[PDB]
């Protein structure tokens, strides 16, 4: 059985297992954390000798103390396997090593643990002696990995090595100190020297074995893949049946999908067709197309990018908390999910995606407020352009079908008057003259009188009123009616509001862009009504939108920031604060009212303020009208030290008599009368409620069915009419869809009142901040795993057996199916359209559902082991790693790009291959924006730093999404703008570590990574005083080497040729040279060899890499990836400190001193290339760059070669050439046959937009296109492809160049010299 084994190890040592289990066990719950910290401080976990025993002990403890149930325990095992907590612990260590140790005064011997109080270190719990005054920045800032126990004026921090017994007494000193309330307690970690410096073995990634020869196409134990004629069509269909027939189908799919290329000809055997599933063709015809992969998690639709083990563990965790909340009202997990993803519920989300409009009309203000800028039927511009509705309906494309302040008050009077008697043009005239001549809003009669004198065009109708305005009706009615319009729709303030077809669009940045989007969306909405005959010939088009429009607009109910929405769990509120909610004044909703009428309202208000008590009167008024509402009042006062229980006690006595207040003073007087004893138990539950609900003191809030609006600054903002619309809108979206769906399932017996109903509606709203597949028959295409009756998690997978994406999905889903309380149901849907081979690779996923232990009890390493490997097939090893990870090969003796078992058996003697990779870096990536006119600042330079070193890394901001990235490991970092033009123009207020926001408390520039998902940021940069400047326009040798050359090689041969290339440079120059390599495409054999090349030849080297952005279009073929790396990331791949770089292609040899290329002036161009040889006389026919596409495009410009080129990096960055290359590539890449060789084709396609300096032809020689006479004056040779010959590259080198062997001999003896340095 010939096998292949691949493993991955992290760039940091494995933290002690004990501390890892503490962190994994208490994911984010602090009570579990310190409750377990007590247990290990007893010395309770000291008797467990091995990792297995230690793990075993935690299971009994968590179960016994009530921390976890079976479902949460199973989730703990999987998260523990994933080693999710390891980077979180390493964050503590990096912080401790880089900021604590260099800032700590005093000798450290005996000070294993020590509290830090007021910049003083105490090595003893008794606090007798202080060793030092700690230097550096403030350590008391609360950062992401911190935990706090208790509230205290003083802040105490304990840096402990938990492993030893010396920890226990220190802990108890501050645990009790926090329990009393003297100070707040928090624990930080210290690197424990008891543990070894062994690296960490990781999992949650995939390995692929790609077939590199796919040209072929016209039982167990196979030698090679046999290719067949165009009978591919049945592969998916027959493959799907095989599984159904097996009767252990889950295992069959995994076994088939992992080694699929090998089983191709093995399919179609033993009466294979068996189309019993002929009824399920209707399944594919009604909902999803054939061959498509779709996954659902309790209705939630997931794409491939969202399917990572780390991200999926967090989804289950969030989902269980949500469902447990539901099943406290007697609902099964099955009933609960069914209600959440019900059709009537999903319809409401789509319904509220469709915007609601507001009545912008003059009708209320008697038509004397808004000035109609244009008129389509009476303007004499559009008049004759067909006045028909069918002109609008019969349309396609993007064409147009046709048919506050004092000065403002005065100028409104002026314009209004001037319009009324004289007309629009005369009013227009005043405005235009005022703009140029006076240039201010202030009323000018010197300018006004001139307008009456010139534009006095027959003022008909009502007579003129002359020069001065103070009209009792004109000034009063018109101006105050205008104010009533602005107020009604909240169209003023700091940010005014524009209304397009009754849709509010705030006057900010690119509102026209938003307007255009709705303009097209409204047009398509009209067309569909017209085709169905909904519309008629005599109709006003704007009134179709005004059908459901509301007259008044409340910014609280309908915020312009559509994200702004907050809902609380109602069930939680009445069990957490039962002491409070059983003593609040409650007006029960009438029992003799209907379920549809039912709703639950709670008003939180400061009754010691006029606004707070005004708001309650309106709520009481609203309750008289609506018999179905159940009201609560509570009382939240701003003033502290005065008991809130007294005013609540005043009202609960009058509770029976509530809403019998003929006038407002009756409520005012009820608050003042009565003598009461403060229930201090009530006061305690009251302040706990506000803390849980994140509410401040003296702030007014309104809660209907869990949804909260507030804080209410003025009670005039929320009136009786505002409660009615709030109930109307809320009712529609959340209450009505819950009621229908609930009744359809037959759960409408569980609703016993308004409070009972609110629990359900409030929970379903929290779920989003579909069950369309239940229509499908399941008998012949589906299979289930896990108990549906007990399961809380329901997975629905729709996998196509012939897909490569399916390979990953099955492997991950099998491990998640092993969890207790999870149900999985699978659908197989293949395609009949198979033009090429469906799966061209073997796949294995490294993941375990529970930790694995050694024979010695240690934690087992996790690996991808392939056991069904064909001996004669050429394979490529690839890593399918989570997006935040950067991975390279570290240990391998064979060529991972060219694997063959028969050659390894004939050279090494073994049919078993082992390779190890390294998770070298984890990404810090973000999306930047300018402030306040938010756009991507391109060309901006950034620096990442740490307290130890102020220059960890550097990158530049991209145009697309303001993208940037850094390569880093767990720890505390900071982002500063690079010294120069960047800091001159900008200042960055924040790095968006909390979200898009701004969330309060995020005015920070600190970044920390404590997860395998890296760190996602949304930084903000605001321009410095009065700047419209750009980093482009006016207001390396010492660091690296004389010459900087970069290259890339794929195979052992290309790496061997790369060794020759570097040597030829060295022999041919008495200068300093530095070599740069694209790190991830090189072999470990080459990687381990270079220091020996560097010692012999006297050069410097540096490994560089960049991770292919998620937005940027991928390359499925690795050779295409390599080409992209040479052209797409030139500006970001190399550090800012380097002035220029030169690319030389691996199969090249150089006879010249390479400095000359540096000194060559590039005539203000960012990069320079050499053209194709014309010298060969008889080669012409195969010169394709003088034909059709290339000759039409390159009218006079040359066809350049990407074998050798210069990049003036400083100018490249300055010109921002990279951004243009990237977006043109992405745009061109939609067509698959777009770039044959992108590396050559992209600079050639961009040479008119981006200048290309052309090089002397002395710089390149190739036998194929240059004459033999030419080689005497040749500087460098590429070894250009045949193309009509058969001689290989090894042959050309020895025949074409005689000194090639001399270079090869030097490397050969050195390799042997190195080989004898191991026994
Ligand atoms: C962080 O992790 C910890 C640990 O898991 C969680 O903290 C603790 O969780 C446990 C549950 O695992 C809590 O105790 C349980 O409480 C339930 C509920 O019953 C009643 O008791 C509550 C107080 O314990 C109280 O809030 C409610 O009481 C009502 O009635 C009183 C009447 O006087 C009234 O005053 C209140 O206002 C309430 O109206 C509540 O109804 C209880 O059922 C549990 O008993 C279990 O016992 C065994 C297991 O030992 C089991 O066999 C039984 O079936 C039963 O289920 C248990 O007492 C504990 O109070 C929590 N402590 C803290 C500090 O939180 C924490 O919730 C996690 N947080 C997060 C975010 O995950
Ligand atoms: C730039 C320069 O002068 N380089 C010289 C080279 O020409 C000479 O062949 C070699 C051996 O003497 O020493 C060095
Ligand atoms: C489900 O199966 C029945 C026969 O049992 C068939 O009539 C029906 O059309 C099928 N539905 C779909 C969507 O294929
Ligand atoms: Ca070459």
Numbering used by the authors: 28 to 245, 277 to 461, 506 to 871, 887 to 1152, 1193 to 1476
What does the paper say about this structure?
The resolution of the CtUGGTKif crystal structure is nevertheless sufficient to reveal that the molecule adopts a so far unobserved conformation, which we label “new-intermediate. The CtUGGTkif “new-intermediate” conformation combines a TRXL1-TRXL3 distance as found in the “open” conformation and a TRXL2/TRXL3 relative orientation similar to the one found in the “closed-like” conformation. The TRXL1:TRXL3 domain clamp is open in the “new-intermediate” CtUGGTKif structure (CC1 = 43.2 Å). In the same structure, the TRXL2:TRXL3 domain pair twist adopts a middle-of-the-range value (CC3 = 3.2°). In addition to the three regions that are usually disordered in CtUGGT crystal structures (namely the TRXL4 loop, residues 246–276; the flexible linker between BS2 and the GT24 domain, residues 1,153–1,192; and the residues between the last helix and the ER retrieval motif at the C terminus, residues 1,474–1,510), this structure has disordered regions in the center of the TRXL2 domain (missing residues 461–505); and at the boundary between TRXL3 and TRXL4 (missing residues 862–886). Overall the thermal motion is rather high (= 270 Å2). This is likely due to loose crystal packing. Alternatively, kifunensine has inhibited ERAD mannosidases and our crystal may have grown from a mixture of molecules bearing minor folding defects: the high B factors in this case would be modeling static disorder. PC2 describes a movement in which the TRXL2 domain rotates with respect to TRXL3, with the βS2, TRXL1, and TRXL4 domains also undergoing motion. The motion encoded by PC2 is well represented in the MD starting from the “new-intermediate” CtUGGTKif structure, whose projection in Figure 3D also shows a considerable degree of back-and-forth movement. In particular, the MD simulations starting from the “open,” “intermediate,” and “new-intermediate” CtUGGTKif structures reach conformations with extreme PC values.
